[PDB]
Design a protein around this ligand. Sequence first.
Ligand code: ZN
Lengths: 222, 150, 83, 129, 214, 71, 97, 83, 24
Amino acid sequence: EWIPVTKLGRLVKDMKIKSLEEIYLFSLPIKESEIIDFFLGASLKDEVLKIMPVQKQTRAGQRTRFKAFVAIGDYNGHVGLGVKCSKEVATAIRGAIILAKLSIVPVRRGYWGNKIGKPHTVPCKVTGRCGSVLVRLIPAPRGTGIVSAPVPKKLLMMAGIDDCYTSARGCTATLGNFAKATFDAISKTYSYLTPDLWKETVFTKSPYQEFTDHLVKTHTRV
Amino acid sequence: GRMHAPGKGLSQSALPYRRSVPTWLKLTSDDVKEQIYKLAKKGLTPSQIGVILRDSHGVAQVRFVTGNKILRILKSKGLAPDLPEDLYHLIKKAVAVRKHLERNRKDKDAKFRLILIESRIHRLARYYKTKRVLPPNWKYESSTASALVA
Amino acid sequence: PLARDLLHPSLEEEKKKHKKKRLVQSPNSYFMDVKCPGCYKITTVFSHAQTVVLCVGCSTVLCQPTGGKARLTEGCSFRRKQH
Amino acid sequence: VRMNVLADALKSINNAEKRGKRQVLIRPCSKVIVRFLTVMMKHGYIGEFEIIDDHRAGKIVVNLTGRLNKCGVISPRFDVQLKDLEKWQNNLLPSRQFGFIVLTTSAGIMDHEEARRKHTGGKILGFFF
Amino acid sequence: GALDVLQMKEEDVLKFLAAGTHLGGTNLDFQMEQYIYKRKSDGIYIINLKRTWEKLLLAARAIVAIENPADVSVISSRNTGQRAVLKFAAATGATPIAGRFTPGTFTNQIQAAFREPRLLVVTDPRADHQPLTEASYVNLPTIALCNTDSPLRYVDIAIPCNNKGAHSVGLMWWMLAREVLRMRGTISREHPWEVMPDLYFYRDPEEIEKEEQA
Amino acid sequence: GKCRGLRTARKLRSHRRDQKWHDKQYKKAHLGTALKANPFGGASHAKGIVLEKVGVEAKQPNSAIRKCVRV
Amino acid sequence: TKKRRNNGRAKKGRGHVQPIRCTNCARCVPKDKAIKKFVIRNIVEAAAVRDISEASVFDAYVLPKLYVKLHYCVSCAIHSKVVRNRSREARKDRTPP
Amino acid sequence: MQNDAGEFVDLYVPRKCSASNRIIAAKDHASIQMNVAEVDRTTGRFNGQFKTYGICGAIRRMGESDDSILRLAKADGIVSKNF
Amino acid sequence: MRAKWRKKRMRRLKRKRRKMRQRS
RNA sequence: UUUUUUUUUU
RNA sequence: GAGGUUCGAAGACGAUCAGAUACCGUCGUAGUUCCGACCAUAAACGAUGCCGACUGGCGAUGCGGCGGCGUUAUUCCCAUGACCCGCCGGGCAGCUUCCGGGAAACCAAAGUCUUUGGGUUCCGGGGGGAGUAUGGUUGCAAAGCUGAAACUUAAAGGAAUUGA
Ligand SMILES: [Zn+2]
């Protein structure tokens, strides 16, 4: 019951794209939440963080608008966060989940010490900045859990990382800067140039050129 | 940068990579030493002995041509002055400052510069004390500075 | 320009730059042999001269240091030796 | 006026890669630095380099593959032993999967993994990853 | 293009000299210096014509690489390049935009003017700053007819040229059109193209009226 | 900037001790003046004699009359 | 914070400026910081020039002009109505037209 | 990327820029993947072969993409040696 | 308390204090 | 040409 | 200690108001001037330590050194001056700029800073009490330099958002 309105959206509906991983590869902007809903809708969970009733003071007075943070994650390998400020509590919450899903970014995972077993920690200790908040994720041995504030603890489990230690410098009481700074760090893990990424990337056909005749047929129909 | 000045100057001697004596130089080491001797008997500091040997005559580097430094050739013979030349002229300049100082006591720009130059001797003379260029009991004073110079 | 040839900078750029900061530091000065009108003797004057160079045979000055290169006289010709 | 020359070399190299260039121009050159670059050779964090013999402390030209994130110095040459060398790793290295802490062992300038195999510590000099 | 069948010819030299593609301007860009031979006595930096051919060919290779002509766009703000932009749009199938580039064409997916080209060619980054800035959010590769002072912000490939000159703009557009049509096989390389380059030239309204009346 | 040399540890201990006289917690405890000044004299409890019963007004926002005892 | 990068006056290089008295209130203010303008006013008002001209003996050869230097400090520059307050991007302007 | 058992354990493998050799961010929306078509030596017509050039958004955003492509194509032989 | 005239008052309280100690 | 103050948590 | 030309604390006189111990005007001592010894304070502000490496560019200014098509005066040649084009090193500097950092205002340093170490001095540790008390030392005085404690408070603060 969804109609695509863009190139990537059409490719998702007609099952010409296997998953989101190829999308991350080509750095193509995503502009539909139906892409994420179709792929991992049965394994994605969302949690609202804070709604502070912000307002303003003019010749009329105070009228509160609600702000909504929510991180969306499958608890396995994919998380992202989004914000939404509107006039109503429910409108902010719903839309923020759409944006959080829209801005989902790959979460790269690694091993600590022995490489046996499944990945549970970060590839390396990483930093992210938002305002004055500097969030540093530190690799942890297996079975420790998450050492962070309750909200980033939820964010790291939502991202799927099993064991973490976290150190934060700055005003972490500001939740938005706290989550956004750790997400910048998490987004820096896969962007971090590690030795196992030194292998030369074999360039693959972009989804546009790999599927061009189908793109033209659908666009002429629409 | 400079010791006592806020000058980030960049100008020194950029000696060439080729240490060899130029072929066109139709000069002998004995003649170079003889021209050094003629300048030495005249009473000239080696700083301008090398300068004269460079502008005229045609020597690029005395050290490159012969193999020993100008002060080393003079010191091996024994006619070199006991007081180092750089140490000497700073005392002369301070002497010049103090002559103007007693002529005009109101110049506080001169007083500051004199204090600056005095310590320029003091740090230099301490190093020369350690390297045995001058006796350890050698001291510099305003009263004996006039006797030191000339 | 991400990549510029540090190992082999161009001769035009190297001569354009300062005598320092080079691949191998070298003088911008040179040697050159003096012939003055009315005289046969050949003098040797190094570039950037700072002392009076008077010809013994001609009994006349050759170059007066006026800052920078020693501005020589009118009649004397210059021939830069050794490149 | 210049107290450390390896610290400058590692900083200027880091400053070049952050921009994204292909080569660096190191005004000084110490055998300590080149023994640091030979560890960079074996671990594959920069490419080959040459030394210009200008008779004045030498000059270094270094070719880069842009594979290095940060290279740093511990200017106080701290006396690291085998007991505390593991502590420097978890304090300095981004992860135990990669990265290297280099130190002037009495056996020569070596990375920390080679130090454990040789059972010899020394004075810490720097790190890279 | 290092191939001999793609090497330099003579009629192209005449066209470049007559249109004035090789003078550019006086303002020299630090990242554009490698495309300059030297400068005149008027500060006019003469653009090396070998570099204009090479970047034209390299640009042309990018254009022939796309398999859907309807998925390429052409944008013109200055009216001087609008006519050539339109002719190039009709000749190779590019989608034409003219006048004022409405905001949200590439980023806003809601309005009916939403376009998502796979390639865009740009007459001048200075006059087309808005499409290039909007190109920074859709990772859209662009080809720019760069001047000696054109701001190469969010540019991907640059062809040295004279965007100030009216005739220089139109000639280059026809020349890229001739190259891509030669390369794709629609127009043969063995014979000169039958359409005059003047179809790409924009003429002032007063001059157009005078010519029509006469 | 702060010193880093390997033979300045005495300077480190001195700079830390002479700057430790700058925080309200350390200097309050290690001068011996706070303990001589509080009526308790370092006492968590104390046996006193009830002298007077008084009523003290509350702070500005609260209009209350607390029941304090002078001991 | 700094409302003005210039800090009001034009003196960024030198340490001191000799003061000039304000015309409207007689208050000393540094010259470079004060609002100083050149005023050229005809001796006679444009409407009133004709009444004098009619009685004038001269064959239209006399046009005296009154030129007076004007100096207002900033407290009364506003009262004069000169230098009305500007917008946030407004400040960064110049002569005006 | 690989555990001690030899299995290839990862989610994906992002590309890189061919000049800066730096990982292109998954949400970097200014990074291009430009295709350069190739032609036969004699025919001069497109032969269905293209060469990819990955450029990270930042390098393009700073202004080094134009120089990086030229060096890469000349190295690959597309750009004439006598450039 | 303006900053300067609080300083003036503290000085004048100090001068009165000194005269009291001098007479005592 | 002037025009002071205004009340306690809620 | 020299003379007070002009200004001008203190002070006086005249206007303005309910009061005006002030702004306005007229005088006006000390002062504003020079000389010797004190006094050492300011928003002595770039409210922005010094030495050292790296770290975009564009149009300009000073000095010095280097190259030049030409214009112009000494003239009759070089040469000496002066304008224009650049290059090199030391500067006082804008201006733009997704270099970058910063809470932002704004800044190529207010960058290379958790991916934390080039050397080091001075200096800060919630707000008051308080630059106070006392001791010491300088000064003719006024005051300067050094400088607490008791006690008391949950905020004081910086930047930025829309109104008034
Ligand atoms: Zn006024």
